[PDB]
């Protein structure tokens, strides 16, 4: 657990797929714009992923506050393609528009804290990381209990106001 | 920071402000009820206190689901009580119908990793723990930006729900 | 990494999809017959998984001569059922008739020496265990080469003759 | 605790209340100019602050004689402020022409040996500091008991002697 | 060293000269009575023994409020005797009515914080203990600055009526 | 002990027994070929050699794959020098095209970590090394089982093969 | 290593050639009997092995004054065989009437401290030890150079002269 | 402590009283001639000092060989002049011819080895230094029991003619 | 060193040459009784041996005195025996009274600090041991300078009389 | 011990008796020749020194084949020259063409491996030492049994040969 309010946010790095595809990302990558960056525990779970579709329906709500939103699970990126080109009548993702990151080696979800050794995936955990790369929130969930985008919209432009008049 | 989801909430006690009277608190006595346990950064600021007010307008909301509500600063308890009888008007918190806990040692802070050495006080750090004892979620923000009653609500009905049907 | 020719194969359990369902699975349920165990890097790769379906399409010419497979990845089980679950004709493996053991902590791999610490998931390693729980045999394959049905079977004849014949 | 009779004070810095308004206030400010530097438990107690008020009402009998006085508690300048703006008719300060000293952090309270760790706050003590910054006095007090106003005249007058004449 | 304010005071034995005699004293002889324990530097020197003198003259202001004085310096018992057999004219204390005490070892001295390692001797340094054997009052100072016998006489009764008035 | 897929085979270097004659050989020897490195445990045993006959007849179909096939157990040079100067009738080993590799220190058995401690010799090791140099392959036989020239051929061709094709 | 004049001589165990056949031996065996302990480095060198030759042609002389001798190197037992196999006439031992002592581990040499670290053999090392197993004797030669039975004769006599005689 | 014979004896300084005044006296300053250097317990004890009276009282014995003789104890300088002051007819030394040394901090005596921890004074040791500052002598003696000023000569004596005469 | 005044002398025991006989001699053997223990350098010098014959011809006011004389060096009880039996003429000691205490393995020595490392020897070290085994008296002299008699007698018969008359 | 077969004899110095006489000797004066330097227990013992006579006896054919004698034993140089000018009638060494070294400290003898700490002397080493200062035998032997000149010069013969014929 290296994530510390105030501090810069851990530095990850990985493979995501973005529109279908696999794509190396970082962290730095966002520097210069906010960042909602978000665990889940597991693809292909049977449980409906309501969050990762609420956040990439209502990512043009995020965009306009220069603002990016990234999820994270520890599954393969192969897992996040597949799970994505499956469709949601079948329990899959369906197509997304919010780059899926994965955390194969499990070292960005204990840079984060979010890891559970138990179990080897993830809570749920959500991170607001500024335009600075610093780290300004940070909700942790157990893992029945999802997250609001209202909420996180609510927060980001919360910080984002602090930052221009404060 | 010894506080982990899923694990049990540090345990605490100290004096708090209840009714505008000392009393010895402890975590413990929450046992049987969900609490929210949250932190605050100081009395006395030019910072209207509107968390504190929220969370105390809308009590009732939460005792009508089983739930307490518990406000820390790293403050006296005898600042507290100073704090509580100095008039909204004059920039106090006004009389309030929610505990307030005093973390003088720090400990208590610290073992709830929301302590900030470098100031000697807390950052906005709020708590959801279940009526076993349990760490049920953990919401830490940056000093300027506060916390959602309707939030908290949300959460606390969504792991009680979990609790009943999962 | 604990795995040593002639010392007990290193005790392993954990979820697995044994016939389009979740069942524990454990290295002891396999006492009294040898074991060929073998780790395979991802599921949903762009290779066909010749290897795996080859294990599966001759499991016969192993249990007629008292001798199970295990497959495992690091994979979570739910990625295991969904890979099933996709057709042979779609890179998929199609239904299966040996177990696919998850290995989602790594601790099985690490256990087995075959995990690799940068890409997080396994290379190609086999083990053959015998009846009395012993580590008889270790072939570890660099990722792009994989194994053979026939020389497994070779060495499993082998060390049974071996056995009965002084 | 670092304070030594004989060797130069331990250096502290903070925001101090001077005249109602927040200065960063530093031992070294001091240099040219002997120092009583006492600490005092807490602001708002049910204790009348009698000696506190004593040094700040015969303030001039310390400037005379080349003297400054700076107080200090671990509460927050916050609340140094509050306290000072609560009239003496209401347990208050009222106004004060000393420097009240912040020690939120701890840290000046145990560089001087005068932090209890069960309590949060200090005792009673007070030190005696010469304008070259070297410590000549310390005087410290279990809780319930004050200090005098003549016996610190009286030493800081002998140190001065003493000073001069050899 | 060993001396904390509501601790016991350090335990302490050692020859001592009362009445021109030499007799094994301890701290726990005292118990019962508060005890005003001070060391001060060396006899025989070129300095008037005021202080010494003062508290023996005024000795019944201490023992008709159930105090005793103790003095003390790391000369030897036999160094102190004749300080008291050499008349105050000729430099001497000539007879006394406070106890002697002699630290030779220094080990007093050291669990007391008041010993200069580079002198040899003890600053002047004062100690108020209680009728429990319970630290109270802690007083150092600098060699030059000798200690006022009503200073004392007001700390002594301070703390006896905080002990009995609540 | 040192030898890990993927990296550098562990360095080694020692007399061996070429055509009849005592020469110095090492690893480096053998940079811009495959090499087909295995152990047996010792010369002179009441076992046919047949595997090292077996690599020694059907050298050519190595060899016409840039491949070179070296054998190594811990008795000397000498002993090995004899084994092949005893008719294979005898039991020996007979006239070979096969280098036999002597580690009488068993330095080189423990850096493939093929050494046996209670046994002073090896197992049935065999390691697959490439032409950098980097080990691509090991197999780790308990006693009694031989190895297969189709299966070793079978690996190093496919090694070859996903070499070059991408 | 632990081999000391005078003290009991470290104890052995291991597998030897004894009269065509192989038997487990240990130091303990001799008990009662005066022992000439040997080592020599290595069977199968161009070089008759007239050293082992003498002692065999002239064990009598031992056994008809209560000695045994025992040979012993770092060969397999196996090796011994072979070497014992080979006739004298073609450089090797031919029948043999003394046990060669197989040291594979390196063990014994070790704890005889005749071990050559960097050759994997011993140097020629002698030890006479008395029929208390009591170690008498060390004789410890560099390579090039053998034992004498006549030397090791005169010294044994001695020994039992010197312990019949006081 | 470092004391050892035809070692440089430990470097000494300190406050003596030579002649009635304070000196500070150093072991250097007797380089070019012998010195005895010795301790003694305590001054003012109920014994006749007659050691330290018959060295002094028989000086020139030893300044007509360029011998020198220094006295010490832990007594302070202060006590030493007392001391001195106080007539032979009164238990004191009267005047004296030879330096009183102070060793207060009791380092001096801790480096001479004779500084008794559960006394905190010396016993009775002297040492013969030579002119080139080499210790050429120690009698170390139990306290009941003085040294003698012809001994004293005659080693010395003994010393210079050693040095003289080869 | 070992031996320390007021402290029980260092246990010694050892082969003594007594009256011309080896005889085993222990430091306990003495107990009852005063002993002068003293070591010289070595036997066979040329320096005439006037020490052991003076101690040696005076034996009897030792004896008296209820007093034993041991002499000690490192040389074996052989070179002592030698040494007694070559006669004054020829360099020899001739027939002595005195036990003549062998310190071969220089551990008596050691335990006495008279032991020189860079010679092999001791300097003239003297010990006064008295009846209930604890050390009295330490004098060390270098090399050259032999011990008196007389002194010697001065210090037995002064501690036994202060031994006695209190 | 630091003596190693094929390492340099560990280096030593000392004084030895040569002719009646007290020479420097160092082990690097013997560089360019063979040396026997070997060890005996003590002078002046009842057992007659036989080997010593027969080396020196001898000393002709050492000579004659570049190789010196030189023995050693823990007595000091003056306990030699007793014993070689004491007849061997009287129990003495009597005239001795061989140098004979004092090892008064022990180091030598520790050095070599022969020191006996329980005796203070050496068991009967021998040591054959090269023209370049290499160790090439060791032989070790219990107290009661002496060495042989010819089985001496056998090894000396023995390595010369084999280091001038290959
Ligand atoms: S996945 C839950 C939404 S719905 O498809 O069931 O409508
Ligand atoms: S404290 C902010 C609310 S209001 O009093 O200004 O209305
Ligand atoms: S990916 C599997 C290829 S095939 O089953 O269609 O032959
Ligand atoms: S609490 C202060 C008491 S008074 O100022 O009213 O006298
Ligand atoms: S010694 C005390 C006498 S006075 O200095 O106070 O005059
Ligand atoms: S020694 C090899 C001959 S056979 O056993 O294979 O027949
Ligand atoms: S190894 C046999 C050779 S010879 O010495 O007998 O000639
Ligand atoms: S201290 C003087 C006493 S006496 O020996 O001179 O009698
Ligand atoms: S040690 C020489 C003195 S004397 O015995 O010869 O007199
Ligand atoms: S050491 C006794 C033998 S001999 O020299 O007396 O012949």
Not at 13 to 31: H, M, N, P, S, W
């Amino acid at each position: 657990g290296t994530a510390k309010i105030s501090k810069p946010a851990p530095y990850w790095e990985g493979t995501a797929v973005i529109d279908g595809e696999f794509k190396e990302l970082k962290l730095t990558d966002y520097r210069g714009k906010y960042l909602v960056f978000f665990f889940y525990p597991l693809d292909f779970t049977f449980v409906c992923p309501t969050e990762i579709i609420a956040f990439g329906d209502r990512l043009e709500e995020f965009r306009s506050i220069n603002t990016e939103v990234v999820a994270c699970s520890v599954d393969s990126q192969f897992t996040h393609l597949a799970w994505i080109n499956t469709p949601r009548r079948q329990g899959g993702l369906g197509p997304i528009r919010i780059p899926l990151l994965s955390d194969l080696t499990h070292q960005i979800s204990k840079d984060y804290g979010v890891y559970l050794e138990d179990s080897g995936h993830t809570l749920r955990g959500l991170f607001i990381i500024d335009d600075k790369g610093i780290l300004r929130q940070i909700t942790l969930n157990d893992l029945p209990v999802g997250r609001s985008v209202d909420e996180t919209l609510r927060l980001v432009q919360a910080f984002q106001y602090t930052d221009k008049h404060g």
